[PDB]
Amino acid sequence: VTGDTDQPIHIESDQQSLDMQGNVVTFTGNVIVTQGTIKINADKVVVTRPGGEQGKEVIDGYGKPATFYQMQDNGKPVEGHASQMHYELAKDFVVLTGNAYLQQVDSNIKGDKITYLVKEQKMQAFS
């Protein structure tokens, strides 16, 4: 949605390691990255900030597959998966690589209990 790329980025994971010299933090273990309605799930996320310059950070996510979600202004969510997620914050787009897939949702429903009819019948034949 409008304003997601102006939000703080939150990253939660089981384990975190810092690479001082290389300007890199690596997250492993059910990593969840959020920024507004943007959500990325991965087994490993590498955050790089070349030259220590704020704004130029790069977020790379890896999974089997890693997943992506964002709500659009028009109200329809977008969702996808791929072996790798690449998000340069200065560039305002994400790159999905490796068996990549994207989809759009036009309807949904939440609850404690949902009942869904699995039987359709577009035609019937008689004798």
């Binding site: 102006d6 703080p8 939660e12 994971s13 089981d14 920024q35 914050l89 305002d92």
Partner: peptide
Amino acid sequence: GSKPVPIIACNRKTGKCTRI
């Protein structure tokens, strides 16, 4: 993609967070 945004790392076990 406009101004830089803060990046916050949180450890799941401890709940402790830090800016990175």
